[PDB]
Write a protein that binds this DNA or RNA. Structure first.
Ligand SMILES: Nc1ncnc2c1ncn2[C@@H]1O[C@H](COP(=O)(O)OP(=O)(O)O)[C@@H](O)[C@H]1O
Ligand SMILES: Nc1ncnc2c1ncn2[C@@H]1O[C@H](COP(=O)(O)OP(=O)(O)O)[C@@H](O)[C@H]1O
Ligand SMILES: [Mg+2]
Ligand SMILES: [Mg+2]
Ligand SMILES: [Zn+2]
Ligand SMILES: [Zn+2]
Ligand SMILES: [Zn+2]
Lengths: 635, 272, 387
DNA sequence: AAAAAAAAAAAAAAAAAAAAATTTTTTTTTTTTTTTTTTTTTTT
DNA sequence: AAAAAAAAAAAAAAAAAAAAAAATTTTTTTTTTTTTTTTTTTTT
């Protein structure tokens, strides 16, 4: 006689009151105003703030946090009442409730079994994301021994058939045909995340667990992000996970076996309905946010800007000496190496990719190489770029086999499709890849990144799946000279051992010679020792890391023109550069250096967020290249 | 007309079946042209001149002249497509009654469906609906022969179990032989069967349309009987078809969420 | 979609026209008035006169006679629309039409296969009546394989399942369930009549056959009642009791049998569906009547008899010396034994049965015995009372 | 001459016997592919 | 002569083909036993 879950229904009542009576500081019912928007299609969840829950009613908040799994469909039906009473939605549509701003936090090591079935939030790095699918939630079946339809059987993260046919005189437990049209599904994406690098124990592999994303919180996560998740920890049934027998269910009916049909062996197990109970933790993400959000939300991003950050980046753009200021903020630790500071900053801003009418994809990224004597802050610059920017992947030399370097393949464990696992270039897409010990990359993969640099794209066809993955990343390379030490009496192409096309593709080359000059030596010693003595202070990044990072994200979408005067200056200055080439530089000048100079001029216009590249930018870009290219010093 | 019942059940009722079949016949004969030409006459003329087996009609013209059908089309596309097959068969037989030997069938394709979804966003809310989409063919198997009206030898007595229509959903299975009355080990009569061309392609979202941090997603697609080899790998193609779930694809197997694959019975492929 | 029995359709139209046109001598439509009387429950039958039908139209009568069984369901449907188009009655009530006053008659021995289907009019005494029953007329079935429902599969005086399950991809001819609630029924009684004495040819045993009665005629005939069944001869399927192999009905599809299932033996017979075609002749009566019309409670008889017969009975009742008059009427050929004539007459008129407060039977009827020397007309007295 | 015992024939009912009957799923096997080690071969 | 780079080998893992493995009572027929009825043959 339809026994009622008293606490869950009281939670439905109190939460319906919360929805229809909690009002913002302005005084209006904020969640009424939010429920207004679920009338639209492609929208079936409200996003209720857990802090609002706490403020309105602490008792209900603790009850939900301690009984989240049992109350969840009840809260969903409370929302269904709250929206159907006002607006005239389709009756069949389902709804969901998404929590965020939860006070407590936990770790993937803390997600122990006691946290099963109750709300919890974690942080993670989204490894990979399987495709969207429709998942069956409530099935309608037909019993193939009396053709009676069994209605609305729940799926507990497994294809569940009705436990017995609803007709009393028919004990069908086997032959059921799913009536697909009558059943209702939920949109569903499975994603894999792993422990953040901060939370690793000693000698520990990063654990990884699978997180299920039900409707409307489905494509929000993406591979490579740093996302906080909030939701239940559930258990999804597993089978044949172990070769040792474990916990097994079976009916408690005391039946025996008659002679010739004795309930032994396979017949016996099928008769009793024996089944192993092997489970696995599978987080059930109710909501997903970036763990380090960029904003509290060019014209669209500008609208997303809050007023304070908007005026901040505005006065940033209006600032003069922003050039050296950005240098200092990016590299407070570094002393000297101003050319590397400038080149790497321009690399972060990037150029403007373009494409011809015929279809030739003109490069827009600008790859930089640092080559020098040992212990000259090369790996340090790459680490600075890594730790600074998002979409800043890092790898070093022979630590990355090609498959993980660019792309790999796996089959969808659920469906027939294949998931194209994202390699370093992909995770660095539309960003930076910092490659260290670039000279010590095998030919088999240095050619791969060369293909990426030529085409901004790699097409993988392997193990039964073909695809054309885009990778518009920019490469910052570190290259040790041959012999360990650079030799200024030799050309660059014989100091290092890169392939000639790779060296051609590389946009900027910086030479860092470890000469022994004692004023500089005093400077460096004072600098680093000052840092170690005064770790926390002794940094004067005039703009905070978040400030300049937001400035980069906002500046990126401005695409400079090239005015006619600047074009005249460009051509005449490249002519002067060729006159220099015509003594000799350690790496000769070609039309690729013209391409490099125009791309750097574009990137300086990008730094100042202009819509026109001016002779100021052109002059500075030429100066950068001219000082980068050095005269080989024969005695 | 409209009532409380769903659109699919409505169009399944015989009364509105005759209603909308009459409407399709009506505008096939009468929707003359933008500028008074009776374009359907010339289109059918060329169609039977080549024996194309497949007509195509513009959704803008469809909806503008008669909008009830256009509204019904994405809701329950399969039924509307079957009826329009029958109605187009009627009109082509009216124009050329000699066509009877020619394939006994005409397909109909719908072009310029206004609402294009993107392969990133094809959710539960599009199942059993005719959508329009774009992509690039990553793979395209060869043309295979499919059963369309299959006859079976009852290999107990060699009676020719009559021609069963073969829907795309589940493989046809005869119950028993009308002669010897056995659900015997029936087996297909290779000759009296009239097969149908079947080709399987896989489209994916183009990198020019994929977003910043992403992997392009790929949807399958089935071409049948006239559209096979209408597109090669690497072709940028628009695809219009019934996004579809209920064939036999489902992860009812062990170790799996109750999660369904999907396909697209392609109803029109357009290279670009 | 379908194809009709065109002659049956036009005959139904003309027959409805007959029902709604044919005025009696008064002018009002007697069959319309009887149809009005047909409103009640336990009134699902209209008896019709071939003479009225013939006076309405000749060729209508000729075709009705010559192919009565062809058109007969269509005639019943004609009656049903005729009443329903102007009356209110349960929509599943089936109104049958029987016939009367056919001018010609046939002997029992004149039953011949040329007479099958076409209307007749026989006359033979009743031997025994069987109980009333509900017969199945057309049932709905459920195929036990695909659970498909088949509507109104007509029976042919045998429990016939449909020829095949209505699902095209289903070959069921072997496993059906009658939805007994949705099936429809009709009152039914079979009475076994035999050839009378007069029609018997020399040397022969009488010809006895099992006439059928349907609807309101389910009880009009009783034991001994020499009746006149105006029905139609009909062959029913027969028994598996015939030793001589005769008239196999088999399949035309020429289907053979593969190795292991060679179509030779009982397997082959069932596979081809070869069956016997034996038959017997049964009569399907629709309106029974007495052979000689009996006079065309005391008030019941007074109402049943006509005015001339009534006044004749009345005046002779009043007439004097009716003792002697009836004696000479009932024994005009015998002479003498006048007192015996008197006594047998008084026994014929009988007494009154009486029941007591105790309920013991007290006999009213008289019993008479005649003894005498041989050839004194004893058997003649008995034969006189017999006839 | 009437009664009755026996005979053959016909029928009902209970016990035993007769007959009808492919489809779905799982597992071995083969065959390739990929990783990583080992080996061999070219260079300074 | 020894180091670096490349090629081949060895071994583990995965995907499809095709041969094996498993499940699996109920309804109809019909012979035999028993009783019953009409008749003929025999006895009182
Ligand atoms: N100009 C400099 N300014 C600051 N630190 C420096 C400078 N040159 C060298 N260093 C120090 O040297 C250390 C190692 O430099 P690194 O770039 O890792 O060497 P390599 O280039 O060989 O990897 C850094 O941690 C850094 O503190
Ligand atoms: N007293 C009589 N009056 C008239 N007819 C008589 C008389 N006695 C005998 N008969 C005639 O005798 C004939 C045969 O008589 P029957 O019926 O054989 O008598 P029973 O059967 O008693 O021997 C009849 O035709 C009958 O008319
Ligand atoms: Mg280093
Ligand atoms: Mg006598
Ligand atoms: Zn059941
Ligand atoms: Zn057969
Ligand atoms: Zn059936």
């Amino acid at each position: 006689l339809e026994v009622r879950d008293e606490v869950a229904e009281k939670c439905q009542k109190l939460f319906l009151d919360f929805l229809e009576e909690f009002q913002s500081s302005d005084g209006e019912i904020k969640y009424l105003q939010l429920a207004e928007e679920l009338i639209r299609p492609e929208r079936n969840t409200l996003v209720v703030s857990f802090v609002d829950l706490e403020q309105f009613n602490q008792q209900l908040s603790t009850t939900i946090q301690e009984e989240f799994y049992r109350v969840y469909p009840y809260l969903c039906r409370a929302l269904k009442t709250f929206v159907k009473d006002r607006k005239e939605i389709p009756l069949a549509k389902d709804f969901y409730v998404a929590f965020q701003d939860l006070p407590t936090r936990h770790k993937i090591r803390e997600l122990t079994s006691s946290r099963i079935g109750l709300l919890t939030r974690i942080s993670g790095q989204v490894v990979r994301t399987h495709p969207v699918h429709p998942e069956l939630v409530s099935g309608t079946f037909l019993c193939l021994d009396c053709q009676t339809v069994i209605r609305d059987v729940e799926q507990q993260f497994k294809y569940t058939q009705p436990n017995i046919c609803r007709n009393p005189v028919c004990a069908n437990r086997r032959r059921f045909l799913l009536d697909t049209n009558k059943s209702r599904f939920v949109d569903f994406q499975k994603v894999r995340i792993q422990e953040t690098q901060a939370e690793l124990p000693r000698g520990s592999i990063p654990r990884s667990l699978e997180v299920i994303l039900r409707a409307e919180a489905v494509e929000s996560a993406q591979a490579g992000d740093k996302c906080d998740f909030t939701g239940t920890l559930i258990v999804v049934p597993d089978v044949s996970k172990l070769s040792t027998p474990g916990a097994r269910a079976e009916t408690n009916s005391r039946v025996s076996g008659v002679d010739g049909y004795e309930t032994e062996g396979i017949r016996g197990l099928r008769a009793l309905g024996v089944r192993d109970l092997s489970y696995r933790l599978v987080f059930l993400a109710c909501c997903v946010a970036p763990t380090n959000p960029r904003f509290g939300g060019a014209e669209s991003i500008k609208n997303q800007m809050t007023v304070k950050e908007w005026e901040k980046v505005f006065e940033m753009s209006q600032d003069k000496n922003l050039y050296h200021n950005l240098c200092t903020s990016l590299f407070p630790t570094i002393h000297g190496n101003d050319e590397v500071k400038r080149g790497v900053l321009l690399m972060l801003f990037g150029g403007v990719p373009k494409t011809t009418g015929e279809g030739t994809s003109l490069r827009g990224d600008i790859n930089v190489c640092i080559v020098g004597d040992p212990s000259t802050a090369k790996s340090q610059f790459l680490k600075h770029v890594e730790e600074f920017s998002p979409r800043a992947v890092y790898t070093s030399g022979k630590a990355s086999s090609a498959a993980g370097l660019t792309a790999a393949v796996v089959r969808d464990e659920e469906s027939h499709e294949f998931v194209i696992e994202a390699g370093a270039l992909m995770l660095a897409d539309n960003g930076v890849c910092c490659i260290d010990e670039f000279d010590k990359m095998d030919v088999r993969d240095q050619v791969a990144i060369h293909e990426a640099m030529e085409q901004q794209t790699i097409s993988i066809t392997k193990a039964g799946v073909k695809a054309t993955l885009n990778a518009r990343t920019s490469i910052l390379a570190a290259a040790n000279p041959i012999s360990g030490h650079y030799d200024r009496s030799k050309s660059l192409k014989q100091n290092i051992n890169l392939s000639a096309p790779i060296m051609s593709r590389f946009d900027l080359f910086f030479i860092l010679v470890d000469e022994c000059n004692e004023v500089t030596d005093y400077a460096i010693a004072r600098r680093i020792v000052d840092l170690h003595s005064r770790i926390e202070e002794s940094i004067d990044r005039v703009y905070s890391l978040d400030d300049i990072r937001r400035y980069l994200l906002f500046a990126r979408q401005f695409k400079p023109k090239i005015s006619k005067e600047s074009e005249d200056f460009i051509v005449e200055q490249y002519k002067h550069l060729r006159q220099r080439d015509g003594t000799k530089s350690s790496w000769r000048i070609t039309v690729r250096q013209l391409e490099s100079m125009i791309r750097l001029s574009e990137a300086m216009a990008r730094m100042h967020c202009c819509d026109e590249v001016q002779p100021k930018h052109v002059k500075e870009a030429f100066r950068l290249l001219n000082k980068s290219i050095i005269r080989v010093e024969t005695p | 007309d409209l009532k409380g019942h769903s659109v699919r059940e409505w169009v399944s009722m015989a009364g509105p079946r005759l209603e909308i079949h009459h409407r399709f016949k009506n505008f096939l004969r009468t929707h003359v042209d933008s500028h008074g030409h009776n374009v359907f006459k010339e289109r059918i003329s060329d169609m039977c001149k080549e024996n194309r087996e497949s007509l195509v009609v513009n959704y803008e013209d469809l909806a503008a002249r008669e909008h009830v059908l256009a509204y019904f089309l994405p809701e329950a596309p399969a039924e509307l497509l079957q009826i329009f097959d029958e109605a187009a068969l009627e009109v082509v037989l009216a124009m050329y009654p000699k066509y009877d030997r020619i394939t006994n069938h005409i397909h109909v394709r719908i072009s310029h469906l206004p609402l294009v979804e993107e392969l990133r966003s094809l959710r539960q809310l599009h199942l059993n609906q005719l959508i329009r989409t774009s992509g690039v063919v990553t793979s395209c198997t060869g043309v295979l022969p499919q059963l369309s009206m299959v006859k079976y030898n009852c290999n107990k007595c060699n009676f020719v179990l009559g021609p069963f229509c073969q829907s795309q959903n589940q493989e046809v299975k005869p119950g028993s032989c009308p002669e010897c009355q056995s659900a015997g080990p029936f087996e297909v009569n290779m000759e009296e069967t009239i097969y149908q061309n079947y080709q399987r392609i896989r489209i994916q979202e183009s990198p020019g349309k994929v977003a910043a941090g992403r992997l392009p997603r790929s949807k399958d697609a089935i071409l049948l009987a006239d559209l096979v080899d209408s597109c090669k790998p690497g072709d940028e193609i628009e695809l219009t078809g019934i996004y579809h779930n209920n064939y036999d694809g489902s992860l009812n197997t062990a170790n799996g969420f109750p999660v369904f694959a999907t396909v697209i019975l392609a109803n029109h492929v357009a290279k670009k | 979609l379908e194809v009709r029995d065109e002659v049956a359709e036009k005959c139904q139209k003309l027959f409805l026209d007959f029902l709604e046109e044919f005025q009696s001598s008064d002018g009002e439509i007697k069959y319309l008035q009887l149809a009005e009387e047909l409103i009640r429950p336990e009134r699902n039958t209209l008896v019709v006169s071939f003479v009225d039908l013939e006076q309405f139209n000749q060729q209508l009568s000729t075709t009705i006679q010559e192919e009565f069984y062809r058109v007969y369901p269509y005639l019943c449907r004609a009656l049903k629309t005729f009443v329903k188009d102007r009356k209110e009655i349960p929509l599943a009530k089936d109104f049958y039409v029987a016939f009367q006053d056919l001018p010609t008659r046939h002997k029992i021995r004149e039953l011949t296969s040329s007479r099958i289907g076409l209307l007749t009019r026989i006359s033979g005494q009743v031997v025994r009546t069987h109980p009333v029953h509900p017969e199945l007329v057309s049932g709905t079935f459920l195929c036990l394989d695909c659970q498909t429902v088949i509507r109104d599969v007509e029976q042919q005086f045998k429990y016939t399942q449909p020829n095949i399950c209505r699902n095209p991809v289903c070959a069921n001819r072997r496993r059906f369930l009658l939805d007994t609630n949705k099936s429809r029924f009709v009152d039914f009684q079979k009475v076994r009549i035999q050839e009378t004495q007069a029609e018997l040819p020399r040397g022969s045993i009488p010809r006895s056959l099992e006439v059928i009665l349907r609807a309101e005629a389910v009880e009009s005939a009783q034991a001994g009642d020499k009746c006149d069944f105006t029905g139609t001869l009909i062959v029913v399927p027969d028994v598996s009791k015939l030793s001589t192999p005769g008239a196999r009905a088999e399949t035309n599809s020429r289907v053979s049998g593969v190795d292991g299932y060679e179509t030779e033996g009982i397997r082959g017979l069932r596979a081809l569906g070869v069956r016997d075609l034996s038959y017997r002749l049964v009569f399907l009566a629709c309106c029974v009547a007495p052979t000689n019309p009996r006079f065309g409670t005391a008030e019941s008889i007074k109402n049943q008899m006509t005015v001339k017969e009534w006044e004749k009975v009345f005046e002779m009742s009043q007439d004097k010396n009716l003792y002697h008059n009836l004696c000479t009427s009932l024994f005009p050929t015998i002479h003498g034994n006048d007192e015996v004539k008197r006594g047998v007459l008084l026994m014929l008129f009988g007494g009154v049965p009486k029941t007591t407060g105790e309920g013991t039977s007290l006999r009213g009827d008289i019993n008479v015995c005649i003894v005498g020397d041989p050839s004194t007309a004893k058997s003649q007295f008995l034969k006189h009372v017999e006839e």
